[PDB]
Amino acid sequence: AMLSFEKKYRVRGGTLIGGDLFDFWVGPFYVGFFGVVGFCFTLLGVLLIVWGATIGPTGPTSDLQTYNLWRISIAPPDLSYGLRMAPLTEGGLWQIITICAAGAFISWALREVEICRKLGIGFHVPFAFSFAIGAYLVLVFVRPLLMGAWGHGFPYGILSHLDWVSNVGYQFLHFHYNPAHMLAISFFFTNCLALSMHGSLILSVTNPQKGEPVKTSEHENTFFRDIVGYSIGALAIHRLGLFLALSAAFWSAVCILISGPFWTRGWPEWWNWWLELPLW
Amino acid sequence: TGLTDDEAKEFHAIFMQSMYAWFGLVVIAHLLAWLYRPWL
Amino acid sequence: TGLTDDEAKEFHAIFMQSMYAWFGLVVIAHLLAWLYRPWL
Amino acid sequence: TGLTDDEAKEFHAIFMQSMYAWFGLVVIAHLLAWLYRPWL
Amino acid sequence: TGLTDDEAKEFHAIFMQSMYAWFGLVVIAHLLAWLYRPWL
Amino acid sequence: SAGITHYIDAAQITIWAFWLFFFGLIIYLRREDKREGYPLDSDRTERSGGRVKVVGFPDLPDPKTFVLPHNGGTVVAPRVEAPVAVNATPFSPAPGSPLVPNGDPMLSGFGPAASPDRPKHCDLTFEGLPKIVPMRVAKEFSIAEGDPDPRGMTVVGLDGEVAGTVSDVWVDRSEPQIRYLEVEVAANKKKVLLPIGFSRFDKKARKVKVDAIKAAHFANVPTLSNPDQVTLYEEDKVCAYYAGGKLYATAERAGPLL
Amino acid sequence: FTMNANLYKIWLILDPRRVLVSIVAFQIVLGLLIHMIVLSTDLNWLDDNIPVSYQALGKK
Amino acid sequence: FTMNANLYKIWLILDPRRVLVSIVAFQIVLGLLIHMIVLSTDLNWLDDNIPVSYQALGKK
Amino acid sequence: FTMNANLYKIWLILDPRRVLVSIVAFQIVLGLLIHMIVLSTDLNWLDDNIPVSYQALGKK
Amino acid sequence: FTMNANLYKIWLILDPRRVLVSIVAFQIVLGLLIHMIVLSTDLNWLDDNIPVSYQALGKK
Amino acid sequence: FTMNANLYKIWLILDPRRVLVSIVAFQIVLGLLIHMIVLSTDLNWLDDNIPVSYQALGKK
Amino acid sequence: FTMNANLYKIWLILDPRRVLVSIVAFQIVLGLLIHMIVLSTDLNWLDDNIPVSYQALGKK
Amino acid sequence: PEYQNIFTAVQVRAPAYPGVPLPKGNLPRIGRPIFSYWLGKIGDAQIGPIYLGLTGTLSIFFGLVAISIIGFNMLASVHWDVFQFLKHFFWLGLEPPPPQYGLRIPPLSEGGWWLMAGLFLTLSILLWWVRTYKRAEALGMSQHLSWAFAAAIFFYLVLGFIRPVMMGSWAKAVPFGIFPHLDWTAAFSIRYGNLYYNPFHMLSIAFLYGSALLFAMHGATILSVSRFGGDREIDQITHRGTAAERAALFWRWTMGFNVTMESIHRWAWWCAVLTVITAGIGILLSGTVVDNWYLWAVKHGMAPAYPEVVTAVNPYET
Numbered sequence A: 001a002m003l004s005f006e007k008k009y010r011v012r013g014g015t016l017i018g019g020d021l022f023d024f025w026v027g028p029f030y031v032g033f034f035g036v037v038g039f040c041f042t043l044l045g046v047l048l049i050v051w052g053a054t055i056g057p058t059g060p061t062s063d064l065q066t067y068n069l070w071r072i073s074i075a076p077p078d079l080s081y082g083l084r085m086a087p088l089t090e091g092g093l094w095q096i097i098t099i100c101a102a103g104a105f106i107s108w109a110l111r112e113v114e115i116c117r118k119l120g121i122g123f124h125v126p127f128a129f130s131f132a133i134g135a136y137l138v139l140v141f142v143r144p145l146l147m148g149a150w151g152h153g154f155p156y157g158i159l160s161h162l163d164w165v166s167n168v169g170y171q172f173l174h175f176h177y178n179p180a181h182m183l184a185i186s187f188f189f190t191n192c193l194a195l196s197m198h199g200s201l202i203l204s205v206t207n208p209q210k211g212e213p214v215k216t217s218e219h220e221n222t223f224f225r226d227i228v229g230y231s232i233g234a235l236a237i238h239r240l241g242l243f244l245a246l247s248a249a250f251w252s253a254v255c256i257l258i259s260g261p262f263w264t265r266g267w268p269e270w271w272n273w274w275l276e277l278p279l280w
Numbered sequence B, C, D, E: 001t002g003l004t005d006d007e008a009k010e011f012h013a014i015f016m017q018s019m020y021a022w023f024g025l026v027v028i029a030h031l032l033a034w035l036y037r038p039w040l
Numbered sequence F: 001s002a003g004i005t006h007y008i009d010a011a012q013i014t015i016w017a018f019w020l021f022f023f024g025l026i027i028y029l030r031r032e033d034k035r036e037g038y039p040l041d042s043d044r045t046e047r048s049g050g051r052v053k054v055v056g057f058p059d060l061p062d063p064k065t066f067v068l069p070h071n072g073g074t075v076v077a078p079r080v081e082a083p084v085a086v087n088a089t090p091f092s093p094a095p096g097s098p099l100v101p102n103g104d105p106m107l108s109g110f111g112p113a114a115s116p117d118r119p120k121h122c123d124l125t126f127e128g129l130p131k132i133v134p135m136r137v138a139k140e141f142s143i144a145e146g147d148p149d150p151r152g153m154t155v156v157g158l159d160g161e162v163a164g165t166v167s168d169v170w171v172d173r174s175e176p177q178i179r180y181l182e183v184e185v186a187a188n189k190k191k192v193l194l195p196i197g198f199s200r201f202d203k204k205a206r207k208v209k210v211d212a213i214k215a216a217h218f219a220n221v222p223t224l225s226n227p228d229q230v231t232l233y234e235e236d237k238v239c240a241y242y243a244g245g246k247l248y249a250t251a252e253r254a255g256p257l258l
Numbered sequence G, H, I, J, K, L: 001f002t003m004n005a006n007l008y009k010i011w012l013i014l015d016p017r018r019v020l021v022s023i024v025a026f027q028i029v030l031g032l033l034i035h036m037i038v039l040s041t042d043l044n045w046l047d048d049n050i051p052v053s054y055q056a057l058g059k060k
Numbered sequence M: 001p002e003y004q005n006i007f008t009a010v011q012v013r014a015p016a017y018p019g020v021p022l023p024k025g026n027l028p029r030i031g032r033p034i035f036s037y038w039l040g041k042i043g044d045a046q047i048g049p050i051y052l053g054l055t056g057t058l059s060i061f062f063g064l065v066a067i068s069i070i071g072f073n074m075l076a077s078v079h080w081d082v083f084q085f086l087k088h089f090f091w092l093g094l095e096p097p098p099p100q101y102g103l104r105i106p107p108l109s110e111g112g113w114w115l116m117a118g119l120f121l122t123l124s125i126l127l128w129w130v131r132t133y134k135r136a137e138a139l140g141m142s143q144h145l146s147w148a149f150a151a152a153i154f155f156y157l158v159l160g161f162i163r164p165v166m167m168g169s170w171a172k173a174v175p176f177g178i179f180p181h182l183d184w185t186a187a188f189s190i191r192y193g194n195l196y197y198n199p200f201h202m203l204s205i206a207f208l209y210g211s212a213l214l215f216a217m218h219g220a221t222i223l224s225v226s227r228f229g230g231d232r233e234i235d236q237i238t239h240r241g242t243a244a245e246r247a248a249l250f251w252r253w254t255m256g257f258n259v260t261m262e263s264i265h266r267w268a269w270w271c272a273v274l275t276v277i278t279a280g281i282g283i284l285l286s287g288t289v290v291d292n293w294y295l296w297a298v299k300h301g302m303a304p305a306y307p308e309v310v311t312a313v314n315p316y317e318t
């Protein structure tokens, strides 16, 4: 099915790979060669997460086995396996599922790429997506690699990965002091501010008090200039927000990349370079 | 699909020849691996 | 939906027999599987 | 639904026997399963 | 809405008992369930 | 008994409250999502002759009226839009198949070259003067100290051939900025707009690259029914043509790669 | 009921195709689902050692 | 009373094509919901070891 | 199914190309899935030491 | 007339160049996959010490 | 085992430059992959030191 | 029942539709709130073992 | 290659714009504009004019008072050695009244400065609120900002004022310091049994990630249709263009459904307002209703069990 103005754009071609082979639509989703690959990676991935939930950490009859949505969890192998493929039932499963997830995300990105090529729009979205894909990779590929073992990756489970984040973070005593962490947090927050401000503005102008007509560019600028003496302007706010969100992901990726591989001591201690300068 | 019925015999002929070539090379590797290391 | 009632006659035959071919290798493979290593 | 009164007779006809084919195979597997390994 | 007054009579007729066929299989299954496995 | 632990505590029931407000929220946002593009296009609607208008869940929200300032109008959403023929033919008669554009792809006005029919009037400043106008109409505007003046650079298409040269610069009277480049085309000395979004600068060279279309294509840029202002209609018509070159301007952007 | 029907009129109401494909997808899913459900309980049929235990019918 | 004077015309107010689907989805969904719900309590019907324990009491 | 001779008519309703590719993907993934599922149980056919132990043909 | 005398015709539904490329892709992925799969079990050919222990070829 | 070869025609369907970088890239990746696999396993050559482990040339 | 009399004119000021729905929402919410309030206090009527404890109709 | 609309590559000037006219009552505007070629590199180069009414001035006033108490206190804490102040600034802070005092107004030297800075800060924030509503009315617009700011104020009030009072202790409010307030956050989670199993804080985390997802997506979209003047969201909202069409369609073909140029801003708005609104709820319940979230999650069977491979015998039980 199509939007009421969609048929006029459903052109043929634009692939990266496949050409007319998978060059078709299904419902509202565009397929394409990377969608077929993606669907394969995804389906096998999920279906395997399903088998992991089915077997549990000690076998299907054990009390630790579970189908409870909050507790199902597939965790990596022990560190003793280093960068080798570990047995299926000993964190292997997690490795394969990971390969599938990474491949599905990279496929997804490439499919948005074929979609940009079709619609004749910029490739800002899949580029931006690639930052989340990057973040995911440090959290499953880069970091555990620099650390001589895939087991350093986080488990795939709704709360178990929360536990992972918790203990890895606390290995450094007071993570809040991580300076890249402080940055990333600031960007996630600022992102949240710009988003709330943009949202508010558009909705405040395109829908004004009853009795008033759709507002204008002049209104837009006059308001944020009235309140805080500046208006970065319409275009740019779309530019900033993209900066904030992509940067937030960036600094998260670097804030965790340095936690181990480039820093092993507690994090507040890092700030020592500041209490010890020869100024004081 | 920009093919004629005769231009699907030809491609099919060469494809089939090459694929059976692939499956063949495959059978060799499965044999050496089988000799040195039977798995069943 | 690309076919005539007569072309929906054509596709269906090869589709059915071929699906049957696959199913053949499969059941075959399963009897083969049962001999070497019974599971049920 | 842009189909005629005759092919909603037809579609219905082939579909029902079809569904029954599925249901039959279903009861087959289920009775066999209660046989090899009862669950209640 | 976009139906005739005669074809929501017809629809309603077929629908009611169809719904009831469902209800039948239901009280039936619940009967079976109540018999094998009483719950109160 | 001063200890009968209740199994339900304020946090449970508050998470329940949240989820209910959530569901109502999601639904509502999905209703605002159908103020455009709906009801959808299937061969379910056409097969049924129309008794199957496609809308899904939730349903469509009552029209809302936007009251444009300056004797502009009244817009509604959702609205009833007149169907429009497709300047293309089905790559396959099978459903979900794409269509190949009819004729010279860039002319087709299909695919990356497509666009809707926006008003044949102009966006306006607060005052009500044509928002987007050229610097020749907008006397006051001025380049920013230290920025090459686009005026006089050479516009060059995707294959390195000159297209024309910048004859002027269009600007926003509402949010001061370069919106459009004007191009005195070489091949016929006719004037066309070039969206900033399609133009790259080569300051040390005083050039204005365009990967979008080929030098020649600049000859077919959709035109203005008045050279001192532009209509909404015309903005879409102008940009979409260039966009087409992204998939059409070469016998290779068509993809594949392998 | 001994009543294989009432009225077949339903295909004037529901797209033959959509119900078809839906039954197919949903059935395959329902299948995998129940399959997993069974493999996770006592009723499991693979890790049962059927009909003789295999990870100790041979050296170890 | 409770006798309902005219429950036709209900299909003149509420599109039947939609209403069936409404029921279809809702029923399959509720089916899955309730199934898992009983599956989570004592009224569990699987992990009972019927009729003989299949693990380590099963032929093997 | 469509098992009633007029079971060719199914391809006026389900487009051969799309049905084909879905068949292809579904089959390939399903295969890999089932294979790994089995490789993870006692019916494992790799982690058995068949037909002679290999990790004592190298290690200790 | 039997079959397999008009299955060349398959290339009137599937464009040949692309089908090759897809096939090649499948082959590379399936290849790495199986290699890892076999590597995940005992028949491993790396941490086996063949023909002599290499991790204890450097501590003595 | 059929007759037509002339598999040169292959470059009339697949673009040569892109095939070139495709192969070059694949080879570099496969190279790093395999390197990582053997060094992370027994056939390792770094965590050894010939003729003697060198950080045991200094107990001090 | 105003009680007297030109306090109808109040619907000359505040939209009847809006006022109605406003009351509906406001009440539909408030009811839930106090229901909850009652659930946490002395007036709780469910987890009270009233009039007989039900998780003592067996064990759990 | 193609311009990305990241950096205005060539800018243009016009006499600064003092803006749309406000009705009588909204006082003149002050200050006279300037242009920053570099802001201009990325955005409107115009800097100001600004509006300052009774509200705005009374807020600037309260706010700067509060900033002074915090600062002066920090210089005092390192003994007026501004060098030392500079050295430990990140670690400097103004701690809250000690618990011995409850909710009483404490002596200057024991927290009373915090209560004064807290008092004046809050008043100045809520005055900035009113300010933004006034500034939003003079233009005939709606109060969407003000309903969001009101949400963020809600969380603030929940952190430093509502929970402390409910818990009967100003010492439970957050202290003013960078690293100190980091410690308050961590200690906060520790004291109440791991805030991760607190559902409200999970949702607020889903909404923060979501504000990042939505702004990243929408922003990327709008730039990708910035060639069609998609940034001009106002007219794409009244007179839908191929920008809003290509935009809605990119997402439609990727994930199967989509919104519209107007509605995406409603998804964004609601998702930001949601962070702060789940967040405040999350703090509201800490200590007032739930004391140990890890436990709460266990009581509702959400906490996972792992094979117990490492363990320690409890000396309190020997």
Ligand code: BCL
Pocket (backbone or CB within 6 Å): E022, E025, E026, E027, E029, E030, E033, E037, G014, G018, G019, G020, G022, G023, G026, G034, G037, H021, H023, H024, H027, H028, H029, H030, H031, H032, H038, H043, H044, H045
């Ligand atoms: C202790 C509890 C008892 C139990 C007692 C009951 C009882 C009691 C009942 C069931 C019922 C059901 N049980 Mg039981 N059940 C138990 C154990 C099991 C087990 C198991 C693993 O052991 C399984 C697999 C099931 C499975 C089932 C389902 C077959 C069935 C309900 C189907 C449904 O929702 O209708 C779906 C409803 C519909 C109307 C859909 C009909 C199909 C149509 C065609 C929809 C198909 C999709 C459609 C085509 C898509 C349309 C296209 C769109 C319009 C676009 N039970 C345990 C032993 N079970 C119910 C039953 O028998 O059926 C009455 C019932 O009342």
Ligand code: BCL
Pocket (backbone or CB within 6 Å): A105, A132, A133, A134, A135, A136, A137, A139, A165, A166, A167, A168, A169, A170, A174, A175, A176, A181, A184, A185, A188, A249, A251, A252, A253, A255, A256, M185, M186
């Ligand atoms: C526990 C003790 C430490 C702690 C330890 C850590 C650790 C350890 C980490 C963080 C991480 C981060 N922390 Mg912390 N953190 C602490 C306190 C805080 C506080 C606070 C208020 O005090 C905040 C705001 C944060 C916030 C942050 C973010 C800056 C950052 C994560 C961003 C991210 O993942 O992006 C990346 C986004 C992604 C990876 C998602 C990628 C998307 C992929 C490609 C697609 C997924 C698709 C998937 C299939 C979707 C499913 C959909 C269904 C299919 C339908 N932390 C405490 C003090 N924190 C993480 C980090 O640093 O950054 C990684 C991290 O590793």
Ligand code: BCL
Pocket (backbone or CB within 6 Å): C040, D022, D025, D026, D027, D029, D030, D031, D033, D037, G024, G025, G027, G028, G029, G030, G031, G032, G045, I001, I002, I003, I007, I010, I014, I019, I034
């Ligand atoms: C102890 C329990 C028993 C067991 C008990 C059961 C029971 C009981 C049942 C199954 C069923 C099935 N089991 Mg079992 N099963 C067990 C162990 C296994 C194992 C394994 C690794 O050990 C496997 C792989 C399976 C696999 C299967 C599938 C073959 C099948 C259901 C698939 C499905 O949902 O269809 C989805 C259905 C469809 C998609 C419709 C059919 C497809 C099309 C429509 C048919 C072609 C139609 C026509 C030619 C027109 C062409 C149309 C085009 C195809 C589009 N079982 C254990 C041993 N199993 C079910 C079954 O057999 O199905 C009859 C069933 O009732």
Ligand code: BCL
Pocket (backbone or CB within 6 Å): L027, L028, L030, L031, L032, L034, L035, L038, L043
């Ligand atoms: C019974 C146990 C709970 C109780 C549980 C519920 C539940 C459950 C509900 C309400 C609801 C309502 N309750 Mg109550 N409610 C109780 C205590 C009170 C008291 C009080 C002074 O104590 C008051 C004023 C109310 C008031 C009301 C209304 C606010 C509201 C429904 C109508 C409405 O909004 O219009 C205004 C109505 C009025 C102003 C009339 C006041 C109602 C009665 C007459 C007041 C009873 C107390 C009164 C002093 C007489 C007491 C008896 C003498 C002591 C002998 N409840 C006790 C604590 N209440 C309903 C609701 O909120 O949703 C609509 C609902 O679903």
Ligand code: BCL
Pocket (backbone or CB within 6 Å): A165, A189, M067, M121, M125, M152, M153, M155, M156, M159, M185, M186, M188, M189, M190, M195, M196, M200, M201, M204, M205, M206, M208, M275, M276, M278, M279, M280, M281, M282, M283
């Ligand atoms: C550190 C141990 C716990 C932790 C404990 C907490 C605690 C405790 C809290 C959070 C809070 C939050 N955490 Mg946490 N958090 C942790 C791990 C994480 C992780 C992660 C990847 O692991 C993430 C993503 C987060 C994310 C989040 C945010 C989603 C959430 C509130 C965001 C916000 O902006 O509110 C901040 C916005 C505001 C406060 C409003 C700002 C408006 C004010 C008025 C601005 C005034 C400006 C001023 C007047 C200008 C003058 C300046 C003067 C100098 C003052 N946390 C670990 C597990 N987290 C909050 C929460 O969830 O509570 C349930 C909270 O309070």
Ligand SMILES: CC[C@H]1c2cc3[nH]c4c(c3C)C(=O)[C@H](C(=O)OC)c4c3nc(cc4[nH]c(cc(n2)[C@@H]1C)c(C(C)=O)c4C)[C@@H](C)[C@@H]3CCC(=O)OC/C=C(\C)CCC[C@H](C)CCC[C@H](C)CCCC(C)C
Pocket (backbone or CB within 6 Å): A038, A041, A042, A043, A044, A045, A046, A049, A097, A098, A100, A101, A102, A104, A105, A108, A109, A112, A125, A126, A127, A128, A129, A130, A131, A132, A133, A155, A156, A157, A158, A161, A245, A246, A249, M209, M210, M212, M213, M216, M217, M220, M254, M255
């Ligand atoms: C980098 C800046 C922000 C960002 C950007 C971003 N994300 C994006 C995009 C962009 C620009 C897209 O265009 C793309 C999208 O499609 O939009 C919704 C996407 C996306 N953002 C999503 C998720 C996401 N992004 C996140 C964050 C971020 N993304 C940053 C905040 C987060 C988090 C953790 O905060 C999540 C969860 C997806 C909805 C979508 C990409 C989805 C996709 O690619 O689908 C293909 C894959 C599948 C359908 C699943 C594959 C199955 C796997 C084999 C199993 C998964 C295993 C998994 C590793 C286990 C994890 C278990 C959990 C319980 C922990």
Ligand SMILES: CC[C@H]1c2cc3[nH]c4c(c3C)C(=O)[C@H](C(=O)OC)c4c3nc(cc4[nH]c(cc(n2)[C@@H]1C)c(C(C)=O)c4C)[C@@H](C)[C@@H]3CCC(=O)OC/C=C(\C)CCC[C@H](C)CCC[C@H](C)CCCC(C)C
Pocket (backbone or CB within 6 Å): A189, A190, A192, A193, A196, A197, A227, A228, M059, M060, M061, M062, M063, M064, M124, M125, M126, M128, M129, M132, M145, M146, M148, M149, M150, M151, M152, M272, M273, M274, M275, M276
């Ligand atoms: C969905 C909620 C998100 C959000 C939304 C949000 N924030 C907001 C708003 C909204 C809707 C506003 O309306 C308001 C705003 O103004 O936006 C720009 C604001 C606000 N958010 C801000 C901060 C903020 N918001 C945050 C968080 C959040 N806000 C969430 C992400 C954060 C976090 C936690 O990181 C911060 C730090 C402020 C910019 C602003 C509130 C400012 C305020 O309240 O002012 C109080 C008074 C002062 C600061 C005193 C003024 C100090 C001057 C700078 C000194 C100038 C001196 C001058 C030269 C005169 C000379 C002095 C004379 C005395 C001599």
Ligand SMILES: COC1=C(OC)C(=O)C(C/C=C(\C)CC/C=C(\C)CC/C=C(\C)CC/C=C(\C)CC/C=C(\C)CC/C=C(\C)CC/C=C(\C)CCC=C(C)C)=C(C)C1=O
Pocket (backbone or CB within 6 Å): A190, A193, A194, A197, A198, A199, A201, A202, A220, A221, A224, A230, A231, A232, A233, A234, A235, A237, A239, A240, A242, A243, A246, A247, A250, M006
């Ligand atoms: C409708 O349109 C709208 C307007 O138009 C009229 C408005 O004017 C407005 C008003 C908007 C505003 C006033 C904007 C307000 C913005 C605020 C408050 C944000 C606060 C930001 C700051 C204080 C500046 C912080 C940033 C810096 C100091 C730069 C620091 C540089 C660093 C750390 C190094 C840079 C390098 C990296 C981050 C590494 C890698 C990063 C990337 C790869 C990111 C890529 C980015 C892109 C953009 C592609 C709105 C809301 C609006 O919606």
Ligand SMILES: COC(C)(C)C/C=C/C(C)=C/C=C/C(C)=C/C=C/C(C)=C/C=C/C=C(C)/C=C/C=C(C)/C=C/C=C(C)/C=C/CC(C)(C)OC
Pocket (backbone or CB within 6 Å): E006, E007, E008, E010, E011, E012, E014, E015, E016, E018, E019, E020, E022, G007, G008, G009, G010, G011, G012, G013, H023, H027, H030, H033, H034, H037
């Ligand atoms: C073209 O032809 C024209 C003239 C139209 C005529 C044709 C007409 C035709 C062919 C009509 C076809 C009609 C059909 C096939 C009708 C079939 C109808 C069916 C199957 C109806 C089923 C109805 C089921 C109902 C109403 C059940 C509803 C159940 C509900 C609402 C359950 C709610 C459950 C709750 C609240 C459970 C709570 C328990 C737990 C614990 C789960 O709560 C958390």
Ligand SMILES: COC(C)(C)C/C=C/C(C)=C/C=C/C(C)=C/C=C/C(C)=C/C=C\C=C(C)\C=C\C=C(C)\C=C\C=C(C)\C=C\CC(C)(C)OC
Pocket (backbone or CB within 6 Å): M067, M068, M070, M071, M072, M075, M105, M115, M117, M118, M119, M120, M122, M123, M156, M157, M159, M160, M161, M173, M174, M175, M176, M177, M178, M181
């Ligand atoms: C030398 O320095 C000179 C220039 C003097 C000035 C320098 C000043 C500087 C540099 C100050 C630096 C300040 C910094 C960095 C402050 C950072 C503060 C941070 C990070 C705070 C973080 C969180 C704080 C929160 C959430 C505070 C919450 C407090 C509240 C909500 C207090 C509420 C109190 C109220 C409403 C008071 C009520 C009083 C009543 C009326 C109840 O009394 C009866």
Ligand SMILES: [Ba+2]
Pocket (backbone or CB within 6 Å): A276, A277, A278, A280
């Ligand atoms: Ba010193």
Ligand SMILES: [Ba+2]
Pocket (backbone or CB within 6 Å): A060, A061, A062, A065, G040, G041, G042, H047
């Ligand atoms: Ba179990």
Ligand SMILES: [Ba+2]
Pocket (backbone or CB within 6 Å): G054, G055, G056, I042, I043, I044, I045, I048
């Ligand atoms: Ba075995």
Ligand SMILES: [Ba+2]
Pocket (backbone or CB within 6 Å): H041, H042, H043, H044, H045, H046, H047, H048
């Ligand atoms: Ba039981």
Ligand SMILES: [Ba+2]
Pocket (backbone or CB within 6 Å): G042, G043, G044, G045, G047, G048, H054, H055, H058
């Ligand atoms: Ba068993």
Ligand SMILES: [Ba+2]
Pocket (backbone or CB within 6 Å): I054, I055, I056, I058, J042, J043, J044, J045, J048
């Ligand atoms: Ba070996």
